[PDB]
Amino acid sequence: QMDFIMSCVGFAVGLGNVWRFPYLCYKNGGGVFLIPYVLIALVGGIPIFFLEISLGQFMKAGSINVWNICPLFKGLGYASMVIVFYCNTYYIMVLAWGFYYLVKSFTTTLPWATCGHTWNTPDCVEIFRHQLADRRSPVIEFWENKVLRLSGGLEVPGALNWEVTLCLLACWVLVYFCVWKGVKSTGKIVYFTATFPYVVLVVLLVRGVLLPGALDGIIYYLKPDWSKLGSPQVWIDAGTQIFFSYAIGLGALTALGSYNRFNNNCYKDAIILALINSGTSFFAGFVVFSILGFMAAEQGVHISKVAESGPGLAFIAYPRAVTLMPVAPLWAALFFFMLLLLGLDSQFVGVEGFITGLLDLLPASYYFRFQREISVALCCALCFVIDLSMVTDGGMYVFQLFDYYSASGTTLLWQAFWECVVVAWVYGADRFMDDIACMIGYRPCPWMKWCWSFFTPLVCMGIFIFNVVYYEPLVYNNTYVYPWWGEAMGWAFALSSMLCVPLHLLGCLLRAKGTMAERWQHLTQPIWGLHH
Template sequence: MSEQNSTAPPEKHPKHDAVPPNNNTLPCSISQTDSRDKWSKKMDFLLSVIGFAVDLGNVWRFPYICYQNGGGAFLIPYTIMALFGGVPLFFMELVLGQFHRTGAISIWKRICPIFKGIGFAICIIGLYVSFYYNTIIAWALYYFYSSFSTTLPWISCDNPWNTANCTNYFGKSNITWTNYSKSPAEEFYTRHVLGIHEADGLDYVGGLRWELLICLFLIFTIVYFSLWKGVKTSGKVVWVTATLPYAVLFILLIRGATLPGAWRGILFYLRPNWQKLTDTAVWIDAAAQIFFSLGPGFGVLLALASYNPFNNNCYRDAIITSMVNCLTSFLSGFVIFTVLGYMAEMRDVEVEDVAKDKGPSLLFITYPEAIANMVGSTFFAIIFFLMMITLGLDSTFGGLEAVITAIMDEYPDIIGKRRELFVLGLVIICFTGSLSTLTQGGAYVVKLLEEFGAGCSIIAVVFLEAIAVSWFYGKTN
């Protein structure tokens, strides 16, 4: 029996994609998708993947986690987790998407049909993320609009939204700071942009913020006209949205390095604390950071790679894009901490006192406050928030393209020829789902969705995906 199997020609099952036989014919999955859209250029694909992986989290999450977990010493577990966890999963999704050339739902017909629910879970998670992630971009758009003034509105306490607790102590030694004191940047963000003082937690989120509603409408308009024709249009848009952030990062890095006290921030960022390496939580944080940074499990890599030629070198693509992503995170740390060192110098406090905030507060309170006190503050505010908008749009393009590709590949007879209408309907659903995040208590809703919408869910998805590919792929028909 073993001799017969060794000499018999490879069997090709009609319902399963096998290895191409020796006569150089392609698998059945390829012949079924000859009419599938393809990237106009290889660089369109690379920029789309980089744009998805490099998002707002690279600007604030990595620097914060790095200094919290041992500074320069954190780079050791981060690199190990990237080599043995993040990059292999990243590569696995690129391979699967490129080989089967289909989205996150229908691909499981060819891997293991019983795991098809993973594809639907990916689409649901993608919708959850779109409900809050685009709202953060809308906040950045509002800041971008507000930056077009000779004096930035968050630099003083002389505005209608300020309270008696507003204290502008930046660079002043005769100001008394109390537990009730609020900086002008904080009151601009919480009271003027969000209006969170009018809400009472999740129990009462208040009314809509119409300024933010307009901003979100503009964001989704850009998203729609970037995605409605497929990768041929989105592949052109990313030439701007994926490259502009790097130009802005280098400008901000040069400016930050010339500020007084910048060296304090860099030392605080990179000072190694070797004892942290014995803490299990540090290794968990490293795994979580590299995982959410590269983005396996969101279905985006499957979708983007499915438009590649069958013989594309996706191994090289995985190495290039993952390295660019990790180096961008590292570079962003210098951009952030040079400015935090400057703030510590001006306030005459320790860097850790101004680096205690994480998340949106770092992007919308701490960094804008530092920019407002620089020479040429208007220019740096404009390019900073423009960078945030482009970083967010790239990730939105990828996230929604994953949902679009998955559903269109699963139901080609129903919506296969109606992409423009389907994308319009999906954008309307996402816009409607985001309305709760535009209320006066919308920041609470954003926090809720951020914590529970994708965190544990996406980890479970990747865990099941790895099991299916490792143990079931090729074992069932």
């Protein structure tokens, strides 16, 4: 079906499946991460994915207009906008690093194959003997000393990195050119971009399985650690990983639903997209953890300490796989080209959605002469100004605050929980089921309304409560504990995303008159379109 490919290439299959899931699994521990993943996917992931798709189909509108079913909660739309903005702030940053790798890929010998270069510390060696626990692989040296120039901590920003600055600027001007032109990957390149990733990954997997110690890595990836289930860290990471990789709460899924026709088979669409996202994430995990197993066997250090536990694992594992290929530079170019294409597709969708939302928000009186190009130029420039913070020596640290807090973390649980509450307890789960039955003819499984009513909200609330009760300060690469101001800034992002719903609530309550009950009922009266 068109929806399948449109969503896959669009903003469903992307870095969140190839880059995010790997290091989330690595940080939480390989096997133990999978149980909350599948549990949330069956309980929170699939139901909310279906919710957003079919809500977009029903209302035939995206952005905030989709909440005309309950204008009193229209604030969720605003919240989504904020979230996607933060996403667009740091998502592109990954691309910059990837772009940098691509630029350094075109060489007879890859930069991260030998460590005899200038920036590499004397504590390195190309091949490892059976000092111990101190030697650093050339790939991590290239990732940190050169690509990142990682500083002591977030307290010290350091000197700006000009090469990554230029690469990020190139990514942003490319985003500007494509969004303004509206490339949309044509119609056949779409198909190519739908099938180009897996192919490359497949090759890696074959090489991945043909390595010493890849079995240890894969059993670490699969066999759960039953002790770790107690901590809420795994549950928050898995729930937010699904709500990120599925793009839950970012408003693009409602746009996908609106693009679809009213008479469409949305249930099978949602199930197959969930299966594709989960399977692509699982496949990327296969590749990454096979590579980690090979590195653990070759280093001699334990699997849990081989690579960086932060966002850089996808740039530690995947390039190493390329070094194992016969023609290394060609496969480096191919892999990083596919990664760049995936990121650009996702970022095009996100930036286009954000621009459409802003232009919808702004009244007709604020009609700029060049509103399209002016708006996209301002958004790109502002995002670049914010991104200058993540390019600095300590900038990687800020990226973590944009990863754990701005989009993922507590804010996504809050958004999804309020989604469930507004659609099920306010609008009416049974009435919504009747609407779905009218839309698609037949009726979905009762598991869906059970999930929306008192399963997904309860699970999200429980993870939230276990987080706040047993709060742990965020730690980067299990080495650097964040200070109170970094936590404060991350929570500033979190509250900026979360407060959109309660503040818009109080705003509507104040703008309304009379007794609280009657005005709350008036403001929550659904507003129907011409079709229904």
